[PDB]
Design a protein around this ligand. Structure first.
Ligand SMILES: OC[C@H]1O[C@H](O)[C@H](O)[C@@H](O)[C@H]1O
Ligand SMILES: OC[C@H]1O[C@H](O)[C@H](O)[C@@H](O)[C@H]1O
Ligand code: NA
Lengths: 346, 340
């Protein structure tokens, strides 16, 4: 079933329930996921109204871009030309600049396919918005089906050569309570290398490093606490994890990550080359989620995209988008129960 | 009473009915007026869903900007520097460029004051959007009261020196049917001068012309047909009226214009210096409103703003907006019914 209601400030809340009774909800403010529940438990972080996003933290569950992550000094080179983008984090351009796409009301249409329901959100980034050449016609389709798969499909076309590398900013917390650390979750991730950050400004260091057999090696499932407890320089730099992980094998067919807590698992599939993992390293900020004060490490993202820093590390990829060329990206989060035996204590 | 409903594509329709039983409706799509009706008759032109506006004509009833009207060559000078804005009508920038603020979903909040209800729409125009320096945080408040006054109050703040001169693009048609010309309405307008257009591109000619004792003098109420049957080359040029008229006396307290048909009249008040009057000179286009085929002359605007063309005729005014200055503008359309 599909239900809709005002969510505040003129945004709407679109709630879907599949045949298995799992419910998931989205808002056109930022073409964002608001909630995902199984048996009355929140599997992700979200707020109860649009205003909360605008006043507390506008990134959770949002579609972010046109470029996700940090761009050093807001500088990109487009078809031999240098362009300077809005700089919203010091000299850095973070998630497309200030008042970016995650803050706008997108228009949308819902398509009921029966075993699958699609919510296609649309928005036009005008030419020159935040320094980006355009215009860019974007669309984000979120869909949920009877097999418990939540899929995100991105599409975009630009009138001018530009750059495009958006992502979905959901935060998982299988505890269903923001005040509970995700250190008790087990994580498996098919990546042998990561991108280190230069310093507290979080721009990339410039090298790619092998993490096999370190506390950041999750090729084989391990508790997140192993990482959180680590004193590796990179962990200490950010007080948790806030880095791009380079997938070892590409392809939408491969389970690239799996996050488990007791009998519940979330599997990640994508056609993108990397996954930026940020573990809500907010310290004592304590943003309130459903009246629960969020704890340091009270959430984790799986931002699938071309890794940030390609400006400095060309090997990471090319996010340029030629005029008239159609961009597409697909990311899938799937829910499972009793996928494996995960019985731990923290 | 206030009623909010889905208007299509995620847009909302906010309808306000006052003590008098008069209903006005707006949508966040373009911070726009959709309908205005009395005793079941529409006073303005509008569609029945968000999609229609996007497919048929996105201007009707919308908030247009950041700059309303045509800018020659899309060129403006900001702090001695040339800036080229998005060009969407040949080399001109018309109504802020393509996919402008009238096509966006603005956020909004409703405030019920009892005799008066306000709907405050907000939108951020990012720095560089369509070539305009920013960011510009904008808000447009449409309000309706028990005195049948529909008011529009604009506010803006920019992080950088820029240009700003929006307008409301409602089209009136007291016939209540788009298939009927407005030639039968009577118009009164407190302006003795107008801004002639250069040619069919509709850019300004360069001069200011006295209209006293011409077919365009409405200082004294007269029927539209007059203007419409005039042989003045300017009328002939556009096949109707599509011009900025310069108001003789500035100030919000002066009734600047009045549109009348039978017992029903609309009065216009504004703090702006000019009123752009466009008479829906669409020829055979036949756009459909409520299933009625629009006729050439099937509507008329009162766009209050600084006259277009100030880029070439500085006397007209200056639309610049300095960083950190607060822009404000107010326009009111008041509805009256003679108890005959
Ligand atoms: O809160 C926004 C969040 O976005 C991503 O997760 C970044 O990597 C984090 O450093 C942080 O900036
Ligand atoms: O439909 C848009 C309309 O906008 C204004 O009123 C112009 O002056 C008209 O020439 C026309 O372009
Ligand atoms: Na809506």
């Amino acid at each position: 079933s599909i239900k809709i209601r005002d969510f505040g400030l003129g945004s709407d809340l679109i709630s879907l329930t599949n045949k298995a009774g799992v419910t998931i909800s989205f808002t056109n403010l930022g073409a964002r996921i608001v909630d995902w529940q199984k048996d009355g438990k929140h599997l992700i972080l979200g707020f109860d109204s649009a205003k909360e996003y605008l006043e507390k933290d506008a990134y959770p569950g949002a579609t972010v871009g046109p470029t996700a992550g940090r761009i050093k000094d807001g500088l990109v080179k487009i078809s031999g030309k240098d362009y300077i983008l809005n700089q919203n984090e010091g000299p850095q351009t973070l998630h497309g600049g200030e008042e970016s796409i995650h803050t706008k009301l997108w228009t949308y249409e819902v398509t009921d396919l029966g075993a699958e329901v699609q919510v296609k959100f649309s928005l036009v980034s005008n030419d020159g918005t935040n320094g980006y050449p355009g215009k860019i016609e974007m669309s984000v389709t979120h869909s949920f089906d009877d097999d418990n798969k939540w899929k995100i499909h991105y599409e975009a076309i630009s009138d001018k050569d530009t750059v495009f590398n958006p992502t979905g900013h959901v935060y998982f917390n299988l505890n269903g309570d923001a005040s509970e650390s995700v250190e008790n979750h087990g994580l498996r991730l098919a990546a042998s290398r990561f991108v280190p950050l230069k310093d507290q400004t979080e721009i990339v260091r410039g090298d790619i490093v092998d993490i096999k057999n370190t506390d950041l090696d999750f090729r084989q499932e391990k508790q997140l606490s192993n990482a959180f407890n680590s004193n590796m320089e990179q962990v200490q730099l950010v007080k948790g994890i806030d880095h791009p992980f380079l997938l070892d094998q590409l392809g939408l067919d491969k389970e690239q990550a799996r996050l488990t807590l007791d009998d519940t698992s979330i599997s990640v599939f994508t056609d993108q080359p990397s996954i930026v993992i940020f573990t809500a390293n907010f310290g004592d900020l304590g943003t309130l989620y459903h009246e629960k004060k969020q704890v340091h490490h009270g959430g984790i993202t799986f931002q699938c995209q071309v890794s940030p820093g390609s400006e400095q590390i060309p090997e990471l990829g090319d996010i340029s988008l030629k005029a008239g060329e159609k961009y597409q990206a697909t990311t899938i989060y799937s829910l499972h129960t009793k996928l494996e035996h995960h019985h731990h204590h923290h």
